[PDB]
Design a protein around this ligand. Structure first.
Ligand code: MN
Ligand code: MN
Ligand code: MN
Ligand code: MN
Ligand code: MN
Ligand code: MN
Ligand code: MN
Ligand code: MN
Lengths: 184, 184, 184, 184, 183, 184, 183, 184
């Protein structure tokens, strides 16, 4: 599961919270911690490095170190991760969601913003959304090419603590209309 | 749970499906059946009539039968249900979702589109989003006024069959990229 | 087929034209004439009145004649035709096209804009796009309900004269770059 | 005509299809197959290599191999084909349509987006839409300059097989409202 | 031509003006005054009432007094003038301009916004843009129906006073970039 | 000055606040309280009933009680107050600001949206923005017509308490970047 | 004034014209011809090279030949003309018009789109709109810097041929609604 | 305070003005002068150069002077000032305002537009809005990092002359309706 310190930090904020805007920031932070928790575990299952916000220009400098970062025409995105194997660049995004809606948004954006640079570099750029459905816990991966490389991916985890914390937050703020209808 | 005939219809479509576009229509139909299943059970818990697409103009004719449907300036919406009690009009929408995003959209639309007609009629119009989180199964109701009227609402149900069917669909179409990234 | 007064005017217009812009106006009028010719012939087959730009408001006054036209909230559309039969209002559009694209546009528009007036009048409003494919000459009608009323409709026509006039036009302007890319 | 394997795959798809959306997908695929058959036959008549979706940057590298693909400021378009001759770049698009509407849309986009790179390279860039009318089978080419380059271009083919497959499709789905009004 | 007082008021405004934004307001006012002058003279030529900003809803109440102005669904526009003759409503706009662009914009808007009220009243509504070219002094009117009604129109005026005033203004402010490019 | 209960509630909110977002909410609430205190004092000086957010339809029913509220075509605006006198309707908005920016925005909206109802009612509708500059304490009123109606209007108040509460808030949160850049 | 052949070509076009859309193309062409005539004469008055559609990237290569046209970040515009003098680039646009509206639109666009390339080259880029009022024949130029360079400009021309041609056109097509309101 | 040459010009402009549009130009210039006066005084307190419209591209050439200005992909902003200290680029904006609204706008804009150039240069870019509240005369700076470098900044000024000039202006144009609602 999630780290004890991390759980306790959430427990403390929820217990201290008295206002809708604070409660909504907790809701949002839980979802991001859940996402990052999956990312870490997924990367351990794949035996790849967990990466800390690598902008696309740095991905390119890593794989083609002769390029000039000051002049290259290159998209401005920061994916969760990437892998360069056998001269294919896999651009990886983690998702934790019961639906694909957020995945389609990310895929379309990344796909469209990377076609030109793929052509300029002569490097195929494969967009890989790795989503886990937090209820079923099944993995859903769009990219057949990526699945060829990793055909048997097992990430044995659950999100029971995020669900518990969220459930606690909504019980504590369940008669605050302002919280119930608050946007992120 | 869900009706056997309804489950079996879903089972049949999933088993016959071979194409991403069909699979996505099933995904969407499951979510609507889940929503309607909650609606029916909720209405039984509240001891109110389950209503079949009543346009707002018909809500007004029901509560103020002297009004002229041909001339009244009135919004064009069709809520899931409504209740007129003690000269308050409660406009009710069901939701089944782990998040409030769809609720905020519906609330803002209904709230904004009903202010003028509320003023024209001199009838307070209260917008009531009744959402059940399908994982926790807790009820979340924005309207304090509605909760005053129904303070102890119990809808003892679950969505295990919708989750099972969806899980089956995603397993069967789990190596179809087109399905995994398909929009409704 | 196309008559005498109309065929002859087209040939005369093609023969005297010398500019791309005049030519394209002919191309456009040919297409409007073809659509109108189909409409007339379809109406002879259905034995219904062929109508001349009757606005929706006039459709209401014909079939619910207590309505006050100064007030009624009615949509601002002018459909090719309409039938009111057994308290169902069918709104009719003619199309001559090898594809359904124009039909979907008209359907979505007419369907959306007639929902509210359907609720006010409590008359269901059925939107019927009647399309003829001018190559196969087969009829395609979306409305199952319309087709129950008129189960075998035979419109035995062809568009050979329109095709011939269009080849005359392209024989004369086929190497005029302005014509070839001129907008409607 | 159309490759025999390709004919047979369409016939099988039609025979095994049961849903409106799969039927529309077959319709759209028939149109793309028809475009591509035309493209293949046209390219034989033009004595150029059959290409589809060429990245514009690849074109620039072919015609000016000393350009640095990492830095050149160039548009992102993927035309069907191209020809570079006597220091003129002809950007070529295949169309199969009874009207010029889609041709105008392609031409306006490609022309607008290549003006700047034409100045930078000091290479005139001529946009050539080559359309065959599938009913008359006449070829219509906008560009005077392209037509002066070539001897009279003749592509003597027909689309009878595509018309026959489409007829089979409508024989099966022509009374399905969802098919009739299905969007691509 | 134009009134003596109106002229003097303009000449005095130009004389005391010292800033671009004031100068530009004068330039705008001269054009509105030109348009209104043309309007008054045209109305004299046609022997019709010169009208002062009538909103469409008041047009409707004039022509169809039984209409309830609280409930009628009607466009919000204010044409320069109108004429109701033989159960036809001519909506009239005056233009003073060397090109038709202004005209096309007013026509398209007035035509589009009046279709529905034409149907509701069962009154044909004809949109008439009467433009005078300030250089040639020729009259251009789009409407055949209106010209059949008035086949012989002579408005024998000129705009020399306006051109002259505009000249003084540009004599004083001609080297001020702020004025030359002021909206 | 400001009611003593209201002062004390602000002071308690400031003292018990710990988060940037709760702090910004207090800031926004101080501004609305300042607006409303001004409104209350101005209304005493104008000898009108203190109102806030009046539905425009209520105004019309007050000034023309024979209007049918169900059918009249009227705008949906909720001004701070209004005055009807000698058949002129003055629509009144309170502002507290050192500049006219928000005043122009309110005036343009209210003026544009009341032209049509002014014609229909045959009642001139004059938009009156009454702004007090919180630093100079001078009153600025756009409408000549409103100012001719009234003897010289004097509202001799100050906003020192609001300035003192704001200072307390910034003493506590002025080194919190999230507060400093927090949006309303 | 304008060339004899050019005149005849126009008069012949009006004579054989019989449709509104052809008539309108003539009206457009007359205005472009007027603008180009003014352009050529202005360039003779200023003793500068009359230029044929130079794109900004070619301007840059003229003035700074060391720039790599494949990589330079530069606006896509095509002004009527330019002048590079004492390491200042004057971007020039000709206008023939009675009002400044056209001018304000071209200025605002040219000014905005050239700021960044001015900084990158370290060259000041001045936008000069040279308008002649076709009625008064007075010249109006926004740019003080340009007028300091050329304080005495006389372009002694008129546009009577264009007005006359425009008159024939409106004589033949003056009762065609389609033409009067054609875009 | 404000000097002699500048104070005197303002008084002269106010004294000779007689039109709303001239008056508002004065109001606007007063506000620009006040902002510039604060900038100058702040820069004296920090002992840094007060800069005059230095474009971002020039900021790059000053601090990474190998950059080619003809090519660098750099944002098109002109901040009030900048410091480059210990390989951190601080981008500085002055504000004089009782609220943070204008500061949030500038922050979000400058932050967004500098992300990509930060990655290319591998220099973090810190956005610093320095706001003075002209009533309290307190300084509010969002950047914790900037405030570590300059831990006690004292800008001992007031805006009394600007306030006095603005009252002269309102004394003279306070009953001119055009002035009162005139836009910048
Ligand atoms: Mn992610
Ligand atoms: Mn619902
Ligand atoms: Mn039709
Ligand atoms: Mn193509
Ligand atoms: Mn007018
Ligand atoms: Mn207010
Ligand atoms: Mn020009
Ligand atoms: Mn600033």
């Amino acid at each position: 599961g999630m780290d004890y310190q991390e759980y306790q930090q959430f427990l403390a904020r929820i217990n201290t919270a008295r206002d809708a805007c604070v409660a909504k920031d907790i809701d949002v932070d839980l979802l991001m911690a859940r996402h990052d928790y999956f990312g870490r575990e997924l990367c351990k299952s794949l035996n790849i490095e967990y990466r800390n916000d690598v902008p696309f220009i740095d991905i390119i400098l890593d794989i083609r170190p002769e390029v000039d970062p000051l002049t290259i025409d290159a998209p401005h995105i920061t994916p969760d991760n990437y892998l360069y194997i056998n001269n294919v660049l896999y651009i990886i995004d983690y998702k934790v969601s019961v639906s694909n809606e957020s995945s389609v948004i990310t895929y379309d954006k990344y796909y469209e913003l990377t076609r030109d640079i793929s052509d300029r570099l002569s490097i195929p750029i494969e967009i890989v959304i790795i989503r886990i459905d937090p209820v079923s816990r099944d993995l859903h991966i769009n990219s057949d090419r990526f699945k060829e490389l990793y055909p048997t991916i097992v990430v044995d985890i659950n999100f029971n603590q995020f669900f518990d914390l969220k459930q606690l937050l909504y019980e504590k703020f369940g008669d605050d209309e302002e919280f119930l209808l608050k946007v992120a």
